Amino acid sequence: TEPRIGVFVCHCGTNIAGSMSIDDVVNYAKTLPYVAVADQYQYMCSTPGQKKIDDAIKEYNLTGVVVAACSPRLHEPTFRTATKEGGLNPFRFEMANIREQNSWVHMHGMWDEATQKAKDQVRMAVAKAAKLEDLVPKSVPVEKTAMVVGGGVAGMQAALDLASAGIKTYLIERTPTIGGRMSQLDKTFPTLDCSQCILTPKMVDVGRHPNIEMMTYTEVEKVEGYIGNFDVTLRKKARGVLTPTEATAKGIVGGGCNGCGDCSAVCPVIKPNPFEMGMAPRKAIYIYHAQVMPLIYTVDFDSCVKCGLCVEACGDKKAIDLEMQDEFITVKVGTAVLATGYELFPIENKREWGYKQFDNVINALEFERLICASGPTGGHLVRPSDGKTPMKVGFVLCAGSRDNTGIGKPYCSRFCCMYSLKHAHQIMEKIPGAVAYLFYMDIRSFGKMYEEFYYRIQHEGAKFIRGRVANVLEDKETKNLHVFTEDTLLGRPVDVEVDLLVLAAAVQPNEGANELRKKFGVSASQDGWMLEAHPKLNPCGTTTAGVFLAGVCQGPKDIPDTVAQAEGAASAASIPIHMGEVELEPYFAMCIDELCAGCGMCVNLCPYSALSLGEKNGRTVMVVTEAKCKGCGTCGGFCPGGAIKMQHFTTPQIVAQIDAFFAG
Amino acid sequence: DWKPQILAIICNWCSYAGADLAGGARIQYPPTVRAIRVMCTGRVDMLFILKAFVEGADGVLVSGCHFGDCHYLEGNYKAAKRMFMIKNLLRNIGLDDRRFRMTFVSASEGAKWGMVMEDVTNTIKELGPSPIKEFKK
Amino acid sequence: AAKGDMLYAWAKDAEIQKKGECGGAVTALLKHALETKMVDAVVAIKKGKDLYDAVPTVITNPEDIIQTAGSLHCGTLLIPKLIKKYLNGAKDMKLAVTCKGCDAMAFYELAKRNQINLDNIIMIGVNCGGSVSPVTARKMISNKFGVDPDTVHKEEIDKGQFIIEYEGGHKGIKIDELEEEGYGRRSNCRRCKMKIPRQADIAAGNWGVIGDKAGKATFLEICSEKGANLVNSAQSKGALEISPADPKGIDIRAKVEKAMFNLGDEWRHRDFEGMGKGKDRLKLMMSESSKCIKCYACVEACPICYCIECSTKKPWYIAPGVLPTSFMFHLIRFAHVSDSCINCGQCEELCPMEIPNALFMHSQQVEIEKMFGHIPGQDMTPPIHAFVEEKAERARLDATGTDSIYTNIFT
Amino acid sequence: SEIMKYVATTCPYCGVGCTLNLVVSNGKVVGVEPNQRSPINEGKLCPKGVTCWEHIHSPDRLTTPLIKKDGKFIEASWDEALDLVAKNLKVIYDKHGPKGLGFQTSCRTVNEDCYIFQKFARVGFKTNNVDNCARICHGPSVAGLSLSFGSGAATNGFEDALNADLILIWGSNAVEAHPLAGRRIAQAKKKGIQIIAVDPRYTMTARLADTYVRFNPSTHIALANSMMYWIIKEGLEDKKFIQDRVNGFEDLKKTVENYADAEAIHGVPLDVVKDIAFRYAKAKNAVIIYCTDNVRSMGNLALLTGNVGREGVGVNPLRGQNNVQGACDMGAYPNVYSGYQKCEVAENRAKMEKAWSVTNLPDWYGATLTEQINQCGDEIKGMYILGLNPVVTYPSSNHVKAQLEKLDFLVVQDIFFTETCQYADVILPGACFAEKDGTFTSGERRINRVRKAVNPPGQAKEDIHIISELAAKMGFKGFELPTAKDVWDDMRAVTPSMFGATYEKLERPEGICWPCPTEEHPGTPILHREKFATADGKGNLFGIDYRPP
Ligand SMILES: Cc1cc2nc3c(=O)[nH]c(=O)nc-3n(C[C@H](O)[C@H](O)[C@H](O)COP(=O)(O)OP(=O)(O)OC[C@H]3O[C@@H](n4cnc5c(N)ncnc54)[C@H](O)[C@@H]3O)c2cc1C
Numbered sequence A: 001t002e003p004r005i006g007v008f009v010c011h012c013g014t015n016i017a018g019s020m021s022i023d024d025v026v027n028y029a030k031t032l033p034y035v036a037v038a039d040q041y042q043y044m045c046s047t048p049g050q051k052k053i054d055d056a057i058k059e060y061n062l063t064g065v066v067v068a069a070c071s072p073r074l075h076e077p078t079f080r081t082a083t084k085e086g087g088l089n090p091f092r093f094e095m096a097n098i099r100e101q102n103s104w105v106h107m108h109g110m111w112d113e114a115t116q117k118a119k120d121q122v123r124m125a126v127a128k129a130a131k132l133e134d135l136v137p138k139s140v141p142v143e144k145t146a147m148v149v150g151g152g153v154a155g156m157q158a159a160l161d162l163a164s165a166g167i168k169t170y171l172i173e174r175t176p177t178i179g180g181r182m183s184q185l186d187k188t189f190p191t192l193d194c195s196q197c198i199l200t201p202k203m204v205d206v207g208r209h210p211n212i213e214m215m216t217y218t219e220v221e222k223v224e225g226y227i228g229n230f231d232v233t234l235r236k237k238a239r240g241v242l243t244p245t246e247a248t249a250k251g252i253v254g255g256g257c258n259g260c261g262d263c264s265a266v267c268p269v270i271k272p273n274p275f276e277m278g279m280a281p282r283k284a285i286y287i288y289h290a291q292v293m294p295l296i297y298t299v300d301f302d303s304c305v306k307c308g309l310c311v312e313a314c315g316d317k318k319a320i321d322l323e324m325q326d327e328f329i330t331v332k333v334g335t336a337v338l339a340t341g342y343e344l345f346p347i348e349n350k351r352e353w354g355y356k357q358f359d360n361v362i363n364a365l366e367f368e369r370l371i372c373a374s375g376p377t378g379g380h381l382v383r384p385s386d387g388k389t390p391m392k393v394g395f396v397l398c399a400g401s402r403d404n405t406g407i408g409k410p411y412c413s414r415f416c417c418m419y420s421l422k423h424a425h426q427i428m429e430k431i432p433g434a435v436a437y438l439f440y441m442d443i444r445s446f447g448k449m450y451e452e453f454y455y456r457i458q459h460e461g462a463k464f465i466r467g468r469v470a471n472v473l474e475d476k477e478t479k480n481l482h483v484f485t486e487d488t489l490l491g492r493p494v495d496v497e498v499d500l501l502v503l504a505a506a507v508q509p510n511e512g513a514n515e516l517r518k519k520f521g522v523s524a525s526q527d528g529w530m531l532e533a534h535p536k537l538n539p540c541g542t543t544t545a546g547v548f549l550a551g552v553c554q555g556p557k558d559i560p561d562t563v564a565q566a567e568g569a570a571s572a573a574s575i576p577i578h579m580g581e582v583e584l585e586p587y588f589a590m591c592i593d594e595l596c597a598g599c600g601m602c603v604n605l606c607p608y609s610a611l612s613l614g615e616k617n618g619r620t621v622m623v624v625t626e627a628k629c630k631g632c633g634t635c636g637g638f639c640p641g642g643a644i645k646m647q648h649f650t651t652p653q654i655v656a657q658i659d660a661f662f663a664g
Numbered sequence B: 001d002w003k004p005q006i007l008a009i010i011c012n013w014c015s016y017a018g019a020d021l022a023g024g025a026r027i028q029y030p031p032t033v034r035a036i037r038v039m040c041t042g043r044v045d046m047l048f049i050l051k052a053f054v055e056g057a058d059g060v061l062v063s064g065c066h067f068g069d070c071h072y073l074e075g076n077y078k079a080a081k082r083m084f085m086i087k088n089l090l091r092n093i094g095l096d097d098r099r100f101r102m103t104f105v106s107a108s109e110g111a112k113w114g115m116v117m118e119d120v121t122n123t124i125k126e127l128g129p130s131p132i133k134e135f136k137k
Numbered sequence C: 001a002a003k004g005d006m007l008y009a010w011a012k013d014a015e016i017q018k019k020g021e022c023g024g025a026v027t028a029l030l031k032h033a034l035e036t037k038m039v040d041a042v043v044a045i046k047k048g049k050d051l052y053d054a055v056p057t058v059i060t061n062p063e064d065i066i067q068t069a070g071s072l073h074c075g076t077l078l079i080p081k082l083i084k085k086y087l088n089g090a091k092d093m094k095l096a097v098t099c100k101g102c103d104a105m106a107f108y109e110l111a112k113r114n115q116i117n118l119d120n121i122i123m124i125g126v127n128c129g130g131s132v133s134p135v136t137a138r139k140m141i142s143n144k145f146g147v148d149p150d151t152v153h154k155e156e157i158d159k160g161q162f163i164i165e166y167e168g169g170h171k172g173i174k175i176d177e178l179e180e181e182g183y184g185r186r187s188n189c190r191r192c193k194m195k196i197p198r199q200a201d202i203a204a205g206n207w208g209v210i211g212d213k214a215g216k217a218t219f220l221e222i223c224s225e226k227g228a229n230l231v232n233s234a235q236s237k238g239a240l241e242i243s244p245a246d247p248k249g250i251d252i253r254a255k256v257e258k259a260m261f262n263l264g265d266e267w268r269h270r271d272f273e274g275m276g277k278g279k280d281r282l283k284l285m286m287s288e289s290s291k292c293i294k295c296y297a298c299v300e301a302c303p304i305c306y307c308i309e310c311s312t313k314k315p316w317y318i319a320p321g322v323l324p325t326s327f328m329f330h331l332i333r334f335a336h337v338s339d340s341c342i343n344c345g346q347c348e349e350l351c352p353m354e355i356p357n358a359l360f361m362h363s364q365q366v367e368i369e370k371m372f373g374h375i376p377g378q379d380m381t382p383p384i385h386a387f388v389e390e391k392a393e394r395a396r397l398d399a400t401g402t403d404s405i406y407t408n409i410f411t
Numbered sequence D: 001s002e003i004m005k006y007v008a009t010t011c012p013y014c015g016v017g018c019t020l021n022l023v024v025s026n027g028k029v030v031g032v033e034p035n036q037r038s039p040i041n042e043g044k045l046c047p048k049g050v051t052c053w054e055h056i057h058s059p060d061r062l063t064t065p066l067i068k069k070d071g072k073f074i075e076a077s078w079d080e081a082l083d084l085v086a087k088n089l090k091v092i093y094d095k096h097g098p099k100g101l102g103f104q105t106s107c108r109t110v111n112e113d114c115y116i117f118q119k120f121a122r123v124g125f126k127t128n129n130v131d132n133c134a135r136i137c138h139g140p141s142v143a144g145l146s147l148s149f150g151s152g153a154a155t156n157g158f159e160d161a162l163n164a165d166l167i168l169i170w171g172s173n174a175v176e177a178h179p180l181a182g183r184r185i186a187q188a189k190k191k192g193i194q195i196i197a198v199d200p201r202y203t204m205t206a207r208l209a210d211t212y213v214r215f216n217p218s219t220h221i222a223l224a225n226s227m228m229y230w231i232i233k234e235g236l237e238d239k240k241f242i243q244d245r246v247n248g249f250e251d252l253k254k255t256v257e258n259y260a261d262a263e264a265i266h267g268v269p270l271d272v273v274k275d276i277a278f279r280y281a282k283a284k285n286a287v288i289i290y291c292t293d294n295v296r297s298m299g300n301l302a303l304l305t306g307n308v309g310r311e312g313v314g315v316n317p318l319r320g321q322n323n324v325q326g327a328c329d330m331g332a333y334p335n336v337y338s339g340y341q342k343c344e345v346a347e348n349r350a351k352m353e354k355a356w357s358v359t360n361l362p363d364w365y366g367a368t369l370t371e372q373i374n375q376c377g378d379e380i381k382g383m384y385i386l387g388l389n390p391v392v393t394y395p396s397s398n399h400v401k402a403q404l405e406k407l408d409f410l411v412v413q414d415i416f417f418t419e420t421c422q423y424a425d426v427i428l429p430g431a432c433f434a435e436k437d438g439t440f441t442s443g444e445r446r447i448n449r450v451r452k453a454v455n456p457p458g459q460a461k462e463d464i465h466i467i468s469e470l471a472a473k474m475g476f477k478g479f480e481l482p483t484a485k486d487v488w489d490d491m492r493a494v495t496p497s498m499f500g501a502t503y504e505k506l507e508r509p510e511g512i513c514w515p516c517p518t519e520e521h522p523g524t525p526i527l528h529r530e531k532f533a534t535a536d537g538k539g540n541l542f543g544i545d546y547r548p549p
């Protein structure tokens, strides 16, 4: 009895009136159960139409309004604003599509039938509108901090972008230094710029920025919460050496680790260096290389013998604490960016290339470290077998890639063609008279200035044999490598003699990346990389709200593409922080806990993990995280007990439409 | 001249957009099917379809998005499970399971929407009125 | 004595062995479990006023367990729902429940739905050749056996026939002859195919016992590590006797199980094809369901129905007050339950208006099971709608070779 | 500490007498469960039976006696209220003889309560102004069927209709009220038994019928007369049965002839009445299920076609209340003692004197519930009410209010604080079915047992205990009845009809049907097997004319 509904029918200027009797529709609507006024007008998407709607609202005191007009996706915001201007809730408005679905498809010889269909549509719309409630828009506050996991070029770029946007940001790096893979590269294709030179300003900018907390040598222990508020627990690994800030906080005025290096000079323990791919010695207390952002000299506790000589080497500064353990910090962030990067696929498998059993077979990262001036040698590429300079280097492209055998990877690694060309150029430049052979199977120079780079590499004298390497033997006397394949162009078998063989191995996610992406509720892709919110129109986002992806952890990329992805992720993460609120969907699900039975079937039924099972008044019931719900309606349509309320699309309102369809 | 009574429940993002596009392209089809316009066609409970059939529906059509094209990424699979079980139920209760169907219309297929309307109308006219109306409901 | 052994078990105590149906191993196990403080209570069945009256009982005091020795073939009742209603799903009490195959299936269906805590429940299930409704049993005895039911001392089903020991002797009639007349086991029991409850913690019966231990030993199958520990403890504390089973005993046991499966298939075919097909089946179901008076005993007794407020009570589905209820009332139950129905039969036998609820529900069950491949009462796999997988739906759509869910689905 | 305990008890909500299991957990009823052993319902229950446990532990249950002093009620002790009741009742008796006091009981109480109620109303002060609500809640059916068959109870059981051939429901809400007596109709439909409904509106019960006949309301006797006229006209009457067991046939032939075509007196066309009449009179076994002239005319139909003393025959009124049969059997009725012993005859009065140690029993006709209410201020002053709520139940509630105001010293013992309670001067809390330990007598005359499930809330007591305490305070002798079994034995020791129904026999689930004279008698499920219970062994039919409304 209480609901009073007003029905307004648009002619659309003979677009609707030319196919059906508008007078019949109005005279029929005048007799529906809850109808105070029924009116017709020519163009109700115009200002006089809104004026008439408001006048009718005021003068009949309508509870709700039904407009028989074009599709809701065309003019629903228009009429919602019209109804709101007039003293009614925006979501109290209902629309009957009588143009795109009744008048433009029933033109010829269907006059009574089109009018009858219009009557039915208006009846169903009025039936739904008689049961519409008030949806007050509500939002969730956003913590004004951001977290970036991974200190590589993507993580560094995202952190700098978020900081320069005015947002306090945490940069979480597993290693004692941030630089990442870019720090390991000697040169960069196709410009041949020095990698450390172009990256050092970025590293010092990250180190100096007041809006970035650069927490290195630490990782994520656990994560809870949603887009509004992520409670993230981090473990600070026992660094063993104090920064000057930490030294002052500890109590001693003596600074902590100005980076002199005396401790490493006196340490008696020798261990491999992960930064140099294990080809260089390092002490228990060490730095990765000279150009590390935090120059703080980590100590390797599982290799240290606690001989206590580094402490005398560091006297009057007291930077070394040999007996401290990992700390735990609880940080409250608003959004998160994942930039975990990549590692090399283990090419010790795929036995026909003797990566581990032949000494002069190396991978691409080892080659980069060996040819860089800061590597184990003075930038002089030498054979690991005897230290003599090579004159003949082969490059095996696609090593473990585009492989469907189940050992390698079925995808392309994107950059192995380009850095193989860069390596060929570097060997042909640094060693005079050396010849580079590239055993290739689809040279892929797709990026800007990449084809020109390929042309230049061929012009400088590199040999391109179009054939995937079949197998590799080695001569016992001289540890040179026989490479057996076919030159498919020229159509002949080929056995190439090389002093050095470099495998362009595939790339895979870093170890522990899958555990991290599970910790944030991010699904993997069918290649094993992190999945995207939409492969086309949202390369940065993720199904879980407030989490964004940047860099090769989303998929192998070049440095420029990685930086573009990182900046996009930073922008997407900054948007909710800048706004300060996340507006909830107008039509989220609500659990009526008086009807929930705590079965928990619906929990695994939401794509966005909004639904969870939690206590309330001592009863186990379902809890809806409104920040994650998107109004899909899957849960509400499943629950047998009807304990989930899909507002504006509730079971009573939909059944009311179905009931009115079979009414008079 | 008995007039068929077909009810449609079409998702907002693909099927409703497809019907709008068909209307925009002036594609003609008989005026027999009326729509409901849920958000995701995963909103469709089985009780909706069963209530429609009990109340006197002659045929029921549910239209969603192609697999992998749902706006909410998983709704049409839940809908597909529910509609498969619905087809089982209508066969095993003695109803003609061909009175009900679920189509996958994208937002670019207006002609497909018109073809679906024609096919549904023809099938329901062939099957005749629902038996449930004769038996005291 | 460890996860899959077949054993002959009997009781050390002579009284339990004498009162136990086939060696008192179940009763000895329950008594030992309650002595050792593994469980807080034992939910069992005991005689009421006579042997046709089976009453569930919760026993905390151990020397009251002997009263539960022996089986009652007239007890057609389902334990787990009572546990859920009146023991808070055993969320604080460790329980030891003796159960049939239908009882174990109901346990698992309620566990899938978080309604009970199976980690706090020990299932010593028994084989079941079928149960008889007590009034129907008395009607058989008074009509076909020519005996006053009150004089009967014992009644059971062995070797495929109903035997009654009464004052003056004993009589026996093939169960098939009774069933062709309108007597014998319950309608749902004839269709039942859960003979050996291998989903329980222990499975106890008298099939496969041969020779000198024809009725003096119990065939135990250890179906879990929990049951293995329970049996090992009972053997260690000197409360139970265990012997290796003779392999030919297992051979006849398997043969009897296969024959029971064949009989169940035969009765399934008979009943399902006796319903009808096409418009006649619809007419039958609607005419039958028009009698409902909304007692809700079908909803309240079914293990699967767990909801706080049934959809059959919500006013937008069923109009309140109108007693000639619409067909929607039973269609709601079909939609919600027919995917996972354990054929317990409670819905059919608690119905005041004599509506064959179990027949209809199991009829949809068998079709759902053969298409989706989901067997209801084991291993706590989620119901077919509680968990939807991507590849499964894509393959199911591709199997029909059509772009829509219209035809080419069935054979 | 009874974590889950099953207690078998009879449903208190209608006359079918369905058996159910109350569930007791830590001393409180927590649910209802099926009892499949019961032959009455096989564990099946209607909507009311499923939810018969909700009201047992309501917070509004009375826990202490209440006394009205200058307005609002004040809590009191049992001694104070009982002494006040004794004093005032004695004063009223001594001042105004036996006429003044009036006694009203409900047909919801157990048999022991009603029996001890009438015993207290007669063994003490000698009056038989004791009555029950049967007159207004069930109807005058028993009196008419007693005039026809000698006894007004239902002749056959419920499942006996399964042995019939033409179950004939005559204007009944059988599936609405008493639904599990309509379960038998559904079962007979499955078995393939002809069913005819003559409900004047098309209901759930008439949907089970093979044939449906609609007739204008309040014209039952006219349609019955038309049926009988046609059955007599074409000689489908049982001549052999009529000669040796029925009297008054000639007067019936004289009376019924004036209804050849009784259309416009009832709306049923001639071919329809002929069809239903011939179908009734041709089936070998036919049973009428009814719901004073109407029931008398129904009795006349069964006598004419010889469907009384056999299996699957007879006239079965449904009786509407839990112990409407028990309340009338135990003597809660103005002019009978127990088992319809007709206080008019002096020999039964002498027997009650011998077995009750009392003298000068009343002998005069008592006053019914309407009679007591109408004269509730002139000569009836002071009255005891056991379970009734007269203000709500009776038509023209204002008149009942006024006459209750006219009286002096009402007592409205009950379990709930109803609208009648606040006209009373003393209120004694009672006990519900789950707290008593008596028996119910179903409509089919079966005596089922009510068992103690939980304790009463506070100081509440069973009605037998309260009446015994009141009699002890009033000095009356013969109420030393500690338990309900002793009251049952006392009842047995006087009535010859129910002498053989001991609590040992009633502990069996099947129960015992009421005409059970000897201890080894297995009961009497079928009434009038050999002869009728009138003055002579012949049931007498009557000729009823149709008086327009
Ligand atoms: C041999 C070789 C040569 C190349 N040459 C070129 C070239 O010339 N030009 C070019 O443009 N590109 C080149 N590339 C590609 C280039 O290296 C990548 O595009 C780029 O490094 C990807 O950036 P990123 O920060 O995402 O990767 P990364 O640098 O791997 O980022 C990962 C960072 O996050 C940290 N991290 C990982 N997991 C965790 C965790 N769980 N918690 C915390 N921190 C974590 C890592 O320690 C690291 O600091 C080359 C690649 C290879 C292998």
Ligand SMILES: Cc1cc2nc3c(=O)[nH]c(=O)nc-3n(C[C@H](O)[C@H](O)[C@H](O)COP(=O)(O)OP(=O)(O)OC[C@H]3O[C@@H](n4cnc5c(N)ncnc54)[C@H](O)[C@@H]3O)c2cc1C
Binding pocket: C019, C020, C021, C022, C023, C024, C025, C026, C027, C028, C030, C044, C045, C046, C054, C068, C069, C070, C071, C072, C073, C074, C075, C076, C077, C098, C099, C100, C126, C127, C128, C129, C130, C131, C157, C204, C205, C206, C207, C218
């Ligand atoms: C209705 C029924 C039918 C059976 N049919 C067969 C059959 O065809 N073949 C076969 O080999 N075995 C059958 N059994 C099992 C058979 O009784 C076992 O051999 C025996 O019960 C276990 O051995 P026991 O004597 O050591 O156990 P017992 O010491 O006899 O212990 C029996 C246990 O079962 C419980 N119980 C009794 N009646 C029921 C009931 N109705 N529902 C649930 N629990 C109950 C008792 O409370 C007790 O805990 C049936 C059992 C039942 C209850």
Ligand code: SF4
Binding pocket: A010, A011, A012, A013, A042, A043, A044, A045, A046, A069, A070, A071, A075, A099
């Ligand atoms: S509201 Fe839609 S139908 Fe009406 S005039 Fe505007 S565009 Fe045309």
Ligand code: SF4
Binding pocket: A241, A256, A257, A258, A259, A260, A261, A262, A263, A264, A296, A297, A310, A313, A314, A317, A319, A320
């Ligand atoms: S000796 Fe001390 S100051 Fe020098 S590098 Fe080591 S920790 Fe730093």
Ligand code: SF4
Binding pocket: A263, A266, A267, A268, A269, A283, A284, A285, A299, A303, A304, A305, A306, A307, A308, A309, A310, A311, A322
């Ligand atoms: S204490 Fe450890 S880090 Fe220091 S010098 Fe000795 S081995 Fe090296």
Ligand code: SF4
Binding pocket: A397, A398, A399, A401, A402, A411, A412, A413, A414, A415, A416, A417, A418, A441, A442, A443, A444, A504
């Ligand atoms: S980038 Fe080049 S070398 Fe690497 S997988 Fe792709 S095609 Fe092969």
Ligand code: SF4
Binding pocket: A591, A595, A596, A597, A598, A599, A600, A601, A602, A603, A621, A622, A639, A640, A641, A642, A643, A644
């Ligand atoms: S909302 Fe429904 S499906 Fe989800 S847990 Fe509650 S009762 Fe179960």
Ligand code: SF4
Binding pocket: A588, A589, A605, A606, A607, A608, A609, A610, A611, A624, A628, A629, A630, A631, A632, A633, A634, A635, A636
């Ligand atoms: S509507 Fe969709 S996203 Fe929201 S809670 Fe339900 S299933 Fe999850």
Ligand code: SF4
Binding pocket: C100, C101, C102, C103, C127, C128, C129, C130, C131, C188, C189, C190, C192, C193, C194, C343, C344, C345
């Ligand atoms: S349903 Fe199966 S397990 Fe249950 S009593 Fe019947 S035969 Fe036994």
Ligand code: SF4
Binding pocket: C291, C292, C293, C294, C295, C296, C297, C298, C299, C347, C350, C351, C352, C353, C354, C355, C357
């Ligand atoms: S138990 Fe029978 S009568 Fe009661 S609601 Fe269920 S189907 Fe209807």
Ligand code: SF4
Binding pocket: C301, C302, C303, C304, C337, C340, C341, C342, C343, C344, C345, C346, C347, C348, C357, C358, C361, C362
């Ligand atoms: S619907 Fe009936 S037969 Fe099926 S599981 Fe439930 S109670 Fe048992």
Ligand code: SF4
Binding pocket: A640, A641, C299, C304, C305, C306, C307, C309, C310, C311, C312, C332, C333, C336, C337
């Ligand atoms: S029938 Fe459906 S809605 Fe009702 S209790 Fe069972 S599962 Fe819940």
Ligand code: SF4
Binding pocket: D011, D012, D013, D014, D015, D016, D017, D018, D041, D044, D045, D046, D047, D048, D049, D050, D178, D179, D180, D181
């Ligand atoms: S039929 Fe009567 S006695 Fe039986 S449960 Fe219903 S109300 Fe109670």
Ligand code: FES
Binding pocket: B011, B012, B013, B014, B015, B039, B040, B041, B042, B064, B065, B070, B071, B072, B073, B075, B076
């Ligand atoms: S939005 Fe259309 S299928 Fe989900």
